[PDB]
Amino acid sequence: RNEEKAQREANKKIEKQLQKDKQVYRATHRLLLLGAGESGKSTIVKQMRGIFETKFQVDKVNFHMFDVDERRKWIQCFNDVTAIIFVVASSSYNMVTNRLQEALNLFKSIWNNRWLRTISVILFLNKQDLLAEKVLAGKSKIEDYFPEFARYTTPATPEDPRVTRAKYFIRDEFLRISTASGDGRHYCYPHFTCAVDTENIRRVFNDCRDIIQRMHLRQYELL
Amino acid sequence: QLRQEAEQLKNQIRDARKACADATLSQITNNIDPVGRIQMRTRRTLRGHLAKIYAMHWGTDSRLLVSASQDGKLIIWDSYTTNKVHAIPLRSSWVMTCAYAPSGNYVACGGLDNICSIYNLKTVRVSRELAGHTGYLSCCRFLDDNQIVTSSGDTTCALWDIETGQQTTTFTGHTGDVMSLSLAPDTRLFVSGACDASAKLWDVREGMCRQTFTGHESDINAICFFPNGNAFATGSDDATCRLFDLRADQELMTYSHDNIICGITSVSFSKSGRLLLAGYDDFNCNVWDALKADRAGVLAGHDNRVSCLGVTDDGMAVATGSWDSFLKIWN
Amino acid sequence: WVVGMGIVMSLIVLAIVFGNVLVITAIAKFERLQTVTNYFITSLACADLVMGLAVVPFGAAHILTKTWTFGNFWCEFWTSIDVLCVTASIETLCVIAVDRYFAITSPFKYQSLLTKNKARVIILMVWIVSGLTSFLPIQMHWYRATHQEAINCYAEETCCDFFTNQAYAIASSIVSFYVPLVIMVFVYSRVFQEAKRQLQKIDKSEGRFHEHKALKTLGIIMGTFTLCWLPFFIVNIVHVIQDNLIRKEVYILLNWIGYVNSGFNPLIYCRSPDFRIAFQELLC
Amino acid sequence: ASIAQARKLVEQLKMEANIDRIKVSKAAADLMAYCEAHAKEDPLLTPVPASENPFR
Numbered sequence A: 001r002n003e004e005k006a007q008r009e010a011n012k013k014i015e016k017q018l019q020k021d022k023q024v025y026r027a028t029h030r031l032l033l034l035g036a037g038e039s040g041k042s043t044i045v046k047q048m049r050g051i052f053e054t055k056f057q058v059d060k061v062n063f064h065m066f067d068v069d070e071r072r073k074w075i076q077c078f079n080d081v082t083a084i085i086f087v088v089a090s091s092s093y094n095m096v097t098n099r100l101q102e103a104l105n106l107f108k109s110i111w112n113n114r115w116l117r118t119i120s121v122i123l124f125l126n127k128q129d130l131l132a133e134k135v136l137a138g139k140s141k142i143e144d145y146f147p148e149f150a151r152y153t154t155p156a157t158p159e160d161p162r163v164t165r166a167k168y169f170i171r172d173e174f175l176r177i178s179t180a181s182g183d184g185r186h187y188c189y190p191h192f193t194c195a196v197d198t199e200n201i202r203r204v205f206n207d208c209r210d211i212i213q214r215m216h217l218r219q220y221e222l223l
Numbered sequence B: 001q002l003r004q005e006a007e008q009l010k011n012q013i014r015d016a017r018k019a020c021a022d023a024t025l026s027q028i029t030n031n032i033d034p035v036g037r038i039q040m041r042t043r044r045t046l047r048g049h050l051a052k053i054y055a056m057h058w059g060t061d062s063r064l065l066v067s068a069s070q071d072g073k074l075i076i077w078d079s080y081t082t083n084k085v086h087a088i089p090l091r092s093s094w095v096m097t098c099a100y101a102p103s104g105n106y107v108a109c110g111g112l113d114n115i116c117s118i119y120n121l122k123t124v125r126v127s128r129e130l131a132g133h134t135g136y137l138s139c140c141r142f143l144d145d146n147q148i149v150t151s152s153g154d155t156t157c158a159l160w161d162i163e164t165g166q167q168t169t170t171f172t173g174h175t176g177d178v179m180s181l182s183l184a185p186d187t188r189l190f191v192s193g194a195c196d197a198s199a200k201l202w203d204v205r206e207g208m209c210r211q212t213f214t215g216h217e218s219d220i221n222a223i224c225f226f227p228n229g230n231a232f233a234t235g236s237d238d239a240t241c242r243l244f245d246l247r248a249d250q251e252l253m254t255y256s257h258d259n260i261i262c263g264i265t266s267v268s269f270s271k272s273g274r275l276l277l278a279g280y281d282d283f284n285c286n287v288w289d290a291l292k293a294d295r296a297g298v299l300a301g302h303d304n305r306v307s308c309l310g311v312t313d314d315g316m317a318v319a320t321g322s323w324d325s326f327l328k329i330w331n
Numbered sequence C: 001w002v003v004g005m006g007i008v009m010s011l012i013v014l015a016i017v018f019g020n021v022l023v024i025t026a027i028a029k030f031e032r033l034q035t036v037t038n039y040f041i042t043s044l045a046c047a048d049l050v051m052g053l054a055v056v057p058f059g060a061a062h063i064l065t066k067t068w069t070f071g072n073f074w075c076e077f078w079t080s081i082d083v084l085c086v087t088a089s090i091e092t093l094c095v096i097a098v099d100r101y102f103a104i105t106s107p108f109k110y111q112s113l114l115t116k117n118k119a120r121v122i123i124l125m126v127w128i129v130s131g132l133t134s135f136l137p138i139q140m141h142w143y144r145a146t147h148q149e150a151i152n153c154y155a156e157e158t159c160c161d162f163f164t165n166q167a168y169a170i171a172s173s174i175v176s177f178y179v180p181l182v183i184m185v186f187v188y189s190r191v192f193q194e195a196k197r198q199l200q201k202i203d204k205s206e207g208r209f210h211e212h213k214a215l216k217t218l219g220i221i222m223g224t225f226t227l228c229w230l231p232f233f234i235v236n237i238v239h240v241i242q243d244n245l246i247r248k249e250v251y252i253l254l255n256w257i258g259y260v261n262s263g264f265n266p267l268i269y270c271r272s273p274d275f276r277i278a279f280q281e282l283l284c
Numbered sequence D: 001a002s003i004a005q006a007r008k009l010v011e012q013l014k015m016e017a018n019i020d021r022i023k024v025s026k027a028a029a030d031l032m033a034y035c036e037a038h039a040k041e042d043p044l045l046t047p048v049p050a051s052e053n054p055f056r
């Protein structure tokens, strides 16, 4: 009957180890990096630096980023992440099944998933310079592939009106899906990034802080 | 086209199956009396997991058990005294299955990483790392102490060899993802339930498909095997459990109700095979009757969805795992 | 008149006790409500239950029969318990406000700042500080007055009244009410500012496609507390500064207004949907 | 269809076509017999005394 004492000692040691690990588990924040192919996800993760894990710390806050296709069923495991980062090629509107239409369909499918009811999405609209060159060079029109561009007018804060309309139309097309069935549980944060940019990590930090603050405000019935 | 040319076969096999069914099992089973209301109360509760629990497997001694969580830890429990024995950290934080060796010396666990890992309990360090799958692992079972059969998310099942670390036999034929499998007591034939609403019977020795069943109409999430060895039950997302048969090669009964529209996550039998236990997404578990189709009880007490289920070899208790990071022992 | 007063006041007693016991049992029974924020609510509920089960009925008997039938020791014990419960029932609200401030303003360090070990320490410290100003000054006779009517009332064991000098009537009020007021005001002003900023950001980002709730919640939270406990802790100092200004009848009524505040607390601090579901699971 | 994989299916359906079947009455009777025979050796269905129950 002496084995009971040894078992209790082992249980105590394991409980102490788990108690130590709980704090470091609760301190970190998890982000899921989801993007369509040829969008530029590799460049973004390289700038930030069957699975890939990236470690980075901003202002003494530990973040943890993950990267990973048809009938996505593994997505149920990602209902407790802080936010979902979406990378989409804004200039690939005619590199045809338009590459963009597939991106909007994927975004709509992810938004309405049952297990992702309370997960926000951070949206990166990559490849702005290619889009600007394509719209300015001529022989390519947004109206040709997307008929709705004819009846669209500029809402706005410019950083060349044609490229401004081109930039804002794609953003509004995603924002409409975002606000169709938001219900106040989760929002979207559009952004206009490029390959040669700095402080993209600051955007992620600020958006995570905003998400956490909004959730806390909603919990106490103040928003 | 040419393919359409024998699409008829399927119709001929369906007609033969219809001609085979003389009468439903229900009619045959009508005279026997009902089991009645069965009340089960929880006996033990285990705490220590920091995240949701995905899978668990009872030990062969009906005393110990192992569980896996999203925090990246495997813990071996002791049911009688509810004290932890082991805690193994994991390289990958995403796990979807776990298994316990029949000889009680090895534990295996795989997940979203396309790797199956085996640990040595009595030496706790990594002993082998099996690779070769192009999709996430969904289930794995120890066929013996030297060879293991696994099912992956790339529509294939394989039989491995631990000593050499290379595949021995590869099973192909499904279209959708493979989600769960079970082994016969004789360890000669095993079944699998794919995501294409189809179940197949495989032969380990031959390596070729033998029979196919396509009763369901949605994704199949769990599958169990009747103790006698001549039947198996499965559960899908359409809130229906169906009991098939190997010899008759057709469905015999359906377990469904109009007051439930949620999915099914786990299915298990009892020692006698009279009781069928299935876990739902309705935050609780239901106990059916294998023959009559009546409901005989409910297992409530979990605050989040149930994702695991198991029955001991001697049938002294039944364990449930949920996303609430709690393990409960019922009796 | 006598008949009418008695029945209601029993209804007040029942209303105070029922909600407090219900909240305590609901928090204890279910493991999903064991939250660091719910410990302060448990302490507040316990203090309010002790107050409503200890001081209200004896004061009822006193105000009904107009004669204290017990000894001087029981009078001292009653007056001590009154101050203890009243003082401990407000600093807990201050603690809750500070916790909400930390949770909202500092979202990335909330988890580390507050832990299950720190909550117990804070609650014990608050209870000790509440008890130090209620039993030590009272069991010892340092609070007693000096004028002839006071000592005459002290001598008689059949009557019990409240007589204090300026020092205690100022110190107890400062400790119990005035200090935990400015902190709460500053906290809730900051919370309102943060809510307004977030709402403005949302309107700027997605206004075209798509401050009342926060104002309503802050209004109810501050208004009930200020209306319940404000006049008493002003007349408390006024009746000492000017003797003839305030009569005893006004004092007793303004004090009894405060006791009702314990009944409102479950409605104010337990409207969360999880609490509603837990309440509906039982007692039905 | 013209692709091999579709073509492979037609042959397989065949292999599964030529197997021996039995009447469902025999299978139902066998299942009933097994359940009735092994019905006295399970603790879930039959509540055993707490003395023999290790979880009490």
Ligand SMILES: Nc1nc2c(ncn2[C@@H]2O[C@H](COP(=O)(O)OP(=O)(O)OP(=O)(O)O)[C@@H](O)[C@H]2O)c(=O)[nH]1
Pocket: A035, A036, A037, A038, A039, A040, A041, A042, A043, A126, A127, A128, A129, A193, A194, A195, A196
């Ligand atoms: N100048 C410039 N070039 C870019 C930009 N974004 C992408 N590119 C070009 O695109 C190439 C990078 O492609 P990747 O990011 O590897 O595409 P990917 O990562 O394979 O995309 P996935 O299929 O989603 O993984 C580079 O050679 C760049 O020249 C940009 O913002 N500016």
Ligand SMILES: CN[C@@H]1CCc2c(ccc(O)c2O)[C@H]1O
Pocket: C082, C083, C086, C087, C162, C169, C172, C173, C176, C236, C255
């Ligand atoms: C008899 N009722 C007492 C009188 C004075 C007093 C109360 C509460 C808190 C204080 O700090 C006090 O000075 C009241 O509950």
